[PDB]
Structures are given as C-alpha cells and as structure tokens.
Structure 1
Amino acid sequence: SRVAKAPVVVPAGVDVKINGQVITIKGKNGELTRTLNDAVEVKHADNTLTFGPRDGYADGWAQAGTARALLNSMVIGVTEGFTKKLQLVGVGYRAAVKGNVINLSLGFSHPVDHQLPAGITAECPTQTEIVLKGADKQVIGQVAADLRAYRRPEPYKGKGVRYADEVVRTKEAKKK
C-alpha cells in the first residue's frame, strides 16, 4: 500500500511492454518477464509505473505492493544488476569457475560441481570467494542459497559457505 503507492521510475534506455498482466522490462543488463496477479492493475504513462488494486479483489493493495516491489527490482536488474558475494571458511575449502560451473572443494569425498542457471554468472577473485551477478533478484538469491546449502556455517568455528554480509555467531563446546 505505502509500497504500492510509491511509483517506479523507468529510466532512459529501459523499455516497458505490458500485455495485460504480462510485463516485459528490457534494458542494457538483459530482459526480464513477469506475470502479475490478477488483483494488480498496472498503469504505465510518463517515465513511471503506478500500481493499484483491481475492483472485486479482496487482497488488491497487498498484491499491488508485491507487484511494485518486483517491477522496481526488475528495472534495477536490467540496468545496474545484482551482486551476491559468498566466502568459504575452513581448511581446504576452495572454489573455482569453469564457464557456467562452480567447482567447490568442501571437505567431502567428491568435489562439488554446481551448474549455474541462465542469466547468472560467477567469478572467483580468490580461492575462498564467489561473486554472482545477474538481472533476476530471486534467481541470484536462489543460487546463493543453493551454494551456501552445500556446507551451511557451523556454530563452533564459523566454517562453511557464508554470505559476505553474514553474521556467524559461534559458541563454546559443552564443558567437560
């Protein structure tokens, strides 16, 4: 509602295509398409996008706020883009990129090979760092969660795959 009422400014170079509930947002950093909930009425006009409830839909304003939020990060995606940074903590824990595949050494018998999806690219500045880049905020978040899942940070030494901005609280082992 406060989110829905806030208009999304479409910058110069960003193309907006609306086919009813289907919205295509084209930019320099790629193209993203989303189908908005029927309760959402989207209006283009000027260099902005406005969102409102559709008459007869009980959750219109809650839906319009979600649609707003989504279209705002679609616009950011196809212009600036998104960046998720992960860091490996632990002895022998190393990472490398070979095209669209992240090779992860994480204390297992077999090294882990993670296949990246369309639109997501990775680069390892260090053997203990993964930098993901993409237009889709949801897909980059999913890939970062999938990579972290291979070895989630342990509470005794902070070992595992963590997000760069992650606070890993450690604890002492049971006494005696």
Structure 2
Amino acid sequence: SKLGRTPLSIPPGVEITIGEPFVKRDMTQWKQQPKRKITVQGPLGQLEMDIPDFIKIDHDAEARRATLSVANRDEKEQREMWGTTWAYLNRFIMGVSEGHTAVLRLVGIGYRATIDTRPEKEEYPGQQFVCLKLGFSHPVEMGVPKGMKASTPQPTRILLEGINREQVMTFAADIRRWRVPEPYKGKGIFVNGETIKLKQK
C-alpha cells in the first residue's frame, strides 16, 4: 500500500507505546492470532488499538517517525490491513494532538438545537444532552458519548469534538438520521459541508 509505506510524523507531545505480542484465551476458538497493543498518548487524551502481529512497526524515537510493514505483501489479508492500520494510526495521532471536529447545519423553519443536562437519563455523571426541535410532536434528546464535547455557537449549528474520529462521525450520523436532507427544499441536517442538489421547482 502506497499509504502504509508513507512514514508517520509524530508531532511534539505525542507518544506511541508498542506492546509485545499477546493472545487472550478464547474457549470458542482453537487458535487466536497474536496482536500488539499500540497506545497513542498526548495532550488531548489517549487512544489504544490492537493490530495483527504480521504488521511490523519500526518506531524511531530520535527521528520521531514510525513506518509500518507486513511480513508478506502477496497475502490479500496483509495488504488490506496494511493501509487500514496506517489510516487508523494517522487519525489517532492527529486526534490526540489536535482533535477531530464535526459541524452540523440545521436547515428548515423551526429547526433548533440546545445543549443542556438531563440528570434523569444521564448514562454517566454530567452527561450533556443535545436537544433538537425538528418538527416532531415530541422533543429529540441525544446524550453525547463519554469522551466528546458538544456545543452550539448558533441555534442552527452544532459542533462536536473528540479525540476519536470513529466516535465523532458516528454520533454526527446518529443526529443526522432524524432529518436527512431532502432535495425539494434543502431541509435537514448537513454534516461537514454536506450539500444536496435541489430540484426544478
């Protein structure tokens, strides 16, 4: 993979810790493949992943770089996970250092959003709840997962933040699932500059 070969530039403050191969016993499988635990820590937080063992990481400390390689390029499974594991690390590094953000634009007459607390439905202490008025008979309330910070600079705009991108964009899609953009007027929830071509009339 032309992406896996590309070295990963570790910015200042970010620290990558690579563990040793380990296998957790599973009573339902006769042989578990070893994996390595990679921890990416920095200012905003910490992230962990478990990669296959056939992926080799040459962590250069004094140079602040880390290149990935596989044991057999001719294996389909190793090629695939070579670029996938590289992409996930690039997000982990850029997420623990700068953080990932998602912007939701609410288009429509009467579409509003507010960030408050719901101590009765809170899954954890101090959980924020994004309340959405989207033309429904009932109010829509969604609790932000632990590890994210939601805000509303304007009534018709939401801003999500977190160190995990898969968790951020998955939550943005959970909100957009209430009002998917329509083509006749453009009403709905748009994520990160998402647009929709309108119709004739």
Shift of 1:43: 2.2
Please, which of 58, 81, 90 is the counterpart of residue 63 of structure 1? 81
User: 1:34 — aligned with what?
Assistant: 49
Judge conservation of contact 1:5–1:51 (CA < 8 Å) in 2.
yes
Q: What CA distance in whole angstroms lies between the structure 2 residues aligned with 1:88 and 1:12?
A: 37
> Residue 40 of structure 2 aligns to a residue in which SS?
strand
What are structure 1's unaligned runs of at least 5 residues? none
Q: What CA distance in whole angstroms lies between the structure 1 residues aligned with 2:160 and 2:200?
A: 33
**TM-score, normalisation: structure 1:** 0.92
Q: How many residues align?
A: 173
Q: Deviations over 1:6-29 (max 9, x none)?
A: 011112211111113111100111
Q: What CA distance in whole angstroms lies between the structure 2 residues aligned with 1:164 and 1:32?
A: 24
Shift of 1:164: 4.0
- Pairwise mapping of residues 91-110 of structure 1 onto structure 2 (< 5 A)? 91-99=109-117, 100-110=128-138
Q: What CA distance in whole angstroms lies between the structure 2 residues aligned with 1:56 and 1:81?
A: 33
Q: What CA distance in whole angstroms lies between the structure 2 residues aligned with 1:40 and 1:114?
A: 38
User: 1:50 — aligned with what?
Assistant: 67
Q: Deviations over 1:105-155 (max 9, x none)?
A: 001111100111121111000110000011111111101111111110011
> Residue 118 of structure 1 aligns to a residue in which SS?
coil
In structure 2, give the amino acid aligned to 1:15.
Answer: E
- Pairwise mapping of residues 5-44 of structure 1 onto structure 2 (< 5 A)? 5-20=5-20, 21-44=36-59
Please, which of 82, 89, 95 is the counterpart of residue 100 of structure 2? 82
What are structure 2's unaligned runs of at least 5 residues? 21-35, 118-127
Give the CA RMSD over aligned residues.
Answer: 1.6
Shift of 1:61: 2.6
Q: What CA distance in whole angstroms lies between the structure 1 residues aligned with 2:141 and 2:58?
A: 44
Q: What CA distance in whole angstroms lies between the structure 2 residues aligned with 1:117 and 1:40?
A: 31
User: For the structure 1 residues 164 and 63, does the alpha-carbon distance in structure 2 shift closer, same or farther, using more than 3 Å as the test?
Assistant: closer
